[PDB]
Nucleic acid binder design. Structure first.
Lengths: 80, 84
DNA sequence: CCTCCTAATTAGGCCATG
DNA sequence: CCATGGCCTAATTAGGAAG
């Protein structure tokens, strides 16, 4: 097919494409976080919130409280 | 050269090789974070802590306070410095 | 601590499905 | 409706090893 197209760095107006891009890139960066974490053994935290009010997150042991602790969850919710 | 190599998902014992990977991977995931954020217009928060203790971070407008505030910064500090 | 040669690896449309 | 999930290719991204 046309292969991967060089998308211009800008907000995708087409709701369809925007959402489609989100799911893919969301999964991508999530794996990247996992990889960086395990490979170098460094503490990583990732939080992504979709328009659909979904909060996809990834956190390392010592950083989990940021999203798990009531205190952290509160801050997160406040920011959103 | 040989090209890119299939790195087995595990802790890189070779400290120098490890940090080399970290430097690239880090800047890469940071780029991704920016791209996803600006592209889809969604809120993103990234936090990466090196062995050296450096806390490299990135966050979208709404999430900035998470890393730039007494409450936010404190929480980050507590986690990193609390027993495991 | 922050380029080169290449292969590993994401994604982009697009359509399909839970 | 929304979120993935392949398919087919092409744009990136990191190893390894040096600058």
């Amino acid at each position: 097919t046309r292969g991967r197209v060089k998308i211009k760095m800008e907000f995708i107006d087409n709701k369809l494409r925007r959402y489609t891009t989100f799911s893919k890139r969301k999964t991508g960066i999530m794996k990247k976080a996992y990889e960086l974490s395990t490979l170098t053994g460094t503490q990583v935290l990732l939080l992504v919130a979709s328009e659909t009010g979904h909060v996809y997150t990834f956190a390392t042991r010592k950083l989990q409280p940021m999203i798990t602790s009531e205190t952290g969850k509160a801050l997160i919710q406040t920011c959103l």
